[PDB]
Amino acid sequence: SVLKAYERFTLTQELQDQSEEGTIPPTTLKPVIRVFILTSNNPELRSRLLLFCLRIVLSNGARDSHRFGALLTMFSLPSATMLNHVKLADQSPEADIERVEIDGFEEGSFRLIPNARSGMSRGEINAYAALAEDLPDTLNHATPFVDSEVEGTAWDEIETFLDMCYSVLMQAWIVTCKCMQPAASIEKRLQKYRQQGRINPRYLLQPEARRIIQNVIRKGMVVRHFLTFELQLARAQSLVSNRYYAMVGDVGKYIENCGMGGFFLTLKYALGTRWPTLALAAFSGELTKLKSLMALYQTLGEQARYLALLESPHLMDFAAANYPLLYSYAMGIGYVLDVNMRNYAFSRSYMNKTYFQLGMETARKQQGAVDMRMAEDLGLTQAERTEMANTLAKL
Amino acid sequence: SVLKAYERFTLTQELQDQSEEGTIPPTTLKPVIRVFILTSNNPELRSRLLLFCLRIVLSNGARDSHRFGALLTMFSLPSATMLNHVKLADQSPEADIERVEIDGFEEGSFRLIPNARSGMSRGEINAYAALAEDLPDTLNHATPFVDSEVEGTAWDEIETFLDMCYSVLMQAWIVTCKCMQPAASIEKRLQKYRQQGRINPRYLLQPEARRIIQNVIRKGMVVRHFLTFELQLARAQSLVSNRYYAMVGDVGKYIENCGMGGFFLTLKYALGTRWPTLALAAFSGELTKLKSLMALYQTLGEQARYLALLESPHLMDFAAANYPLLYSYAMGIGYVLDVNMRNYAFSRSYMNKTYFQLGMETARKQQGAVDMRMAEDLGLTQAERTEMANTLAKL
RNA sequence: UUUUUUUUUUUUUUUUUUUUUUUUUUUUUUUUUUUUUUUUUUUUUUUUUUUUUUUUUUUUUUUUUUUUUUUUUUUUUU
């Protein structure tokens, strides 16, 4: 009963808080991010704006705010109306956006011709043009493209712009929730999307361009908020959709629950396996903690998928330090059960090596073990079980 | 019957008092804390006021009321409106705030230019400027910041002010619930936030600057009240939030339940492990006390997390001396189960060495022990427990 | 005391039908099937013994009180 009090104490303190809806935080000063608005549907203008913006993101000298704005502009370039899609960013409590409606480039470019609506000094028009022509020297051939010719393409048709725009944007999406050498995962993502025809090999970025974009995305909270909103929009899409959002929806599935490996891997291997060692008394308190954490996770809503991206403090609640023994135990199981697990960074401060090996050996010696609620539905006999255990221990 | 009477006696007298919510205490004389108010959003002034205030906090000659007011000012500098957030401090029963609306600095400075609204004698203007030029002599280069040339930056853009402001305030947050060399945790909180980009390494403070800030915060109750009000607001934030409060919410989770290690560690290891020795008759009375204490913790509300910060007398209720045997027993368990536990200051006056070793030995010899409610749901067999038990005597 | 995150995560075989498939014997009836003996009554069957009462049967000792009966250790964090 005192033990019953302790279980209820654990679960309620985790969930008391989350009665109320979130309150929008006290207001704070914000940097202004400038996002470019193109009213024209012209393929050549759209493409040069993408190319223009991509260069500012990668440029040596741009401030973070310039880089963020260029990104937000790129991600809005597929829209029929960019303006509506930029207002998505306004939904971020950290965002202060300046829209900068544009109208075109002085051909040869990248000298901005600004819309009537808002002027620009020829100092800043020229300053941007210099910024678009800076670029690091680590990049090969004055461009970010591995193919020193793409930027010289003739953007006569909208098909071509969209093929590049989606291809460039997909590479940004692929590096969205990576803390950052690596990475094997990235090059396999690229290969999936090439074979699906979502990424066109002509428009791959030099690996250096991607690492810079990865960095800007990790730094930019407003940017990440905007990606979250888009990812949610991709969730609500019909089975019959358009090309971009089907694409975003697919890459979104890799991004979901990013940064929460310790929690979900612990569920998968410790509780998923349902081995007899789960009945240890030591796990008892921690088993209640995971139970609360699952309860907490659903109450959070759809957006619990995006805590890492959102930089939410709730990411702290699910930290493995709250269930160190079970985590250790799960890591060991994960270690033998899956070959890919070796390269997971499971090593940690509170990691208890004793329970780690316990998971390891549990997985080797008790694999013949059966879920007796399954075993009874199948009407398994105890001769069948041991000599089910006798094929698997030998294998 | 006598014993059931004893349980209800223990539990009711602990919770008797807590029906009625608390009444605001009889009024007392208070020192005046002066907080500087800035109406301007200009980056250079915001940055100089932060630097000005930081110097007064660290200054040799400032009196405590000055240090407190300067701290309250720094913590309010991110605000779009400082005046509103300083009124949060007014919610403290120990607080008497004078607002001192400011308007700027005479260039070169730190000579305050005060708002028309409230005048200043040129003696007090010059006196403050002198106070900002005190600083201890142990501090290297007459600045904090480690990097001796940061203060010479040109704070022309709001991004830079915020990048510093958040970086400096975060270091204050990290040292908030520390009683007072070492302090190893501080160095890991710092590298965590550097890796998250929440703290910019350019603006780290010299370790002695932090140790002074540590000291100011523990001395200052109204300051500590204000931090609490901020942590509570950080708690109610949406998943989509702003940069500062996401930051505060995260660091806040380290601060929660500070100063209550004995209670929660006893719960964690003694009750969490659910080992058979918990059935000792000696623990019988103390187990009821813990049961009462958890019950007491819930009645207190969310603010039960901040008892150490609040300086609440309730922090005495949870003192380990009320359950010495269970506490001792728990400490021994933690000591073997967790390597980090060695460095906790578990030694105490009422510490009972017999039960400590008992906790120690319980934790080694009975880890194969199973939670019999789990073991039955998994349908564990009596052979399985033993194969598992010194499977677990083990390693 | 400890308490950010790090792996994996598109698809890929097979996938029309096929034989058999009406009927066919037997299938009214048929014996036996009224009755039949015995079958009123019959002994015993009023009552007569005993059947008032009868001893013992007030009370009776003991039966106020009394020792002890303030306090004292431990008790913030880590």
Ligand SMILES: [Pb+2]
């Ligand atoms: Pb504007």
Ligand SMILES: [Pb+2]
């Ligand atoms: Pb505008």
Ligand SMILES: [Pb+2]
């Ligand atoms: Pb991450």
Ligand SMILES: [Pb+2]
């Ligand atoms: Pb006043």
Ligand SMILES: [Pb+2]
């Ligand atoms: Pb005033």
Ligand SMILES: [Pb+2]
């Ligand atoms: Pb990483």
Ligand SMILES: [Pb+2]
């Ligand atoms: Pb007579």
